[PDB]
């Protein structure tokens, strides 16, 4: 710092409108404002906090579930457990991605494939496969929850119908995330600069449909419970239904959050809400699965 300039005394500079004369593939002159750079950095800082939260959430729900379980060895326990372990592993590899050479400011501003190196594409593929090993956990948690919900004393017509439709929908979504993943692969390896997000988007719609369906089902069960307990029950549920509606016993909150996800800013680095729906669903699976594995009438 041999000397400053009068520009430093200017109280109304407002940096954010200035220029960066960087070098790109399009040439050695490419102006960009500090505000766009800071927004690109705030997208990374905004999408890192949520996956740190997910990693810590799943890590500290795994230990609690492990140590507190009164009864173990039931399929739903291991299923939710391995779901949270795939959450932790997905968050780990997504932290690797965030600090990797694909989220770097260099590739964003400067579309130079030479910065990219092989193996990072293997980490991208691995993450896209881990998302499928997570949705598979969720869906083999939900069919193995419906199979306990509707069975036994209940009628085998509504129950078989509900299980059939949920199983068909779930296998269909898993086949969607996969073909999506493979198509994304065949491109990211064919050409690093390409993208394929349509099938990802339709898969997210279909998962939102899966969780909306499960929530609709468990509120239908709540209506049926209240109706039966009114016929000749022990005074019904006295001030005990206040929780069930929206206290994460049911899947209402993720059903709202997915829907509010699309009504945000046009991707101002914040795709958080859809990252919140999956965490809240996988963390609420124990409560709904212990809500469904109940007598429901006495």
């Amino acid at each position: 710092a041999p000397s400053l300039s009068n520009l430093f005394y200017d109280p109304t500079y407002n940096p954010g409108q200035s220029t960066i004369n960087y070098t790109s593939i399009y040439g050695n002159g490419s102006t960009i404002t500090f505000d766009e750079l800071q927004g690109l950095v705030n997208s990374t800082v905004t999408q890192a906090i949520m996956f740190g939260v997910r990693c810590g959430a799943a890590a500290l729900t795994l230990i609690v579930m492990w140590m507190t379980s009164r009864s173990r060895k039931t399929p739903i326990f291991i299923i939710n457990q391995v779901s949270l372990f795939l959450i932790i592993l997905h968050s780990a590899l997504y932290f690797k991605y965030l600090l990797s050479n694909y989220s770097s400011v260099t590739y964003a501003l400067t579309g130079f494939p030479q910065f990219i190196s092989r193996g990072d594409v293997h980490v991208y593929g691995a993450t896209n496969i881990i998302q499928v090993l997570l949705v598979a956990s969720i869906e083999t948690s939900l069919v193995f929850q419906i199979k306990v919900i509707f069975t036994g004393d209940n009628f085998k017509r509504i129950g078989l119908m509900l299980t059939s439709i949920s199983f068909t929908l779930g296998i269909a979504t898993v086949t969607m995330y996969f073909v999506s993943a493979v198509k994304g692969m065949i491109v990211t390896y064919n050409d690093v600069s390409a993208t394929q997000d349509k099938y990802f988007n339709a898969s997210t719609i279909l998962l939102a449909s899966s969780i909306n369906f499960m929530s609709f089902v468990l509120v239908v069960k709540l209506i049926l419970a209240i109706r039966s307990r009114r016929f000749l029950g022990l005074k019904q549920f006295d001030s005990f239904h206040i929780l069930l509606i929206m206290s994460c016993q049911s899947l209402l909150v993720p059903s709202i959050i997915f829907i509010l996800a699309y009504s945000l800013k046009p991707n101002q680095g914040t795709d958080v809400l859809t990252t919140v729906a999956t965490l809240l669903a996988v963390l609420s699976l124990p409560l709904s699965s212990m809500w469904a594995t109940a007598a429901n009438n006495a």
Partner: peptide
């Protein structure tokens, strides 16, 4: 509302 968008190497949420 808007479609979700993925960066050229952003894996699935």
């Amino acid at each position: 509302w808007h479609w979700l968008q993925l960066k050229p190497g952003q894996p699935m949420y």
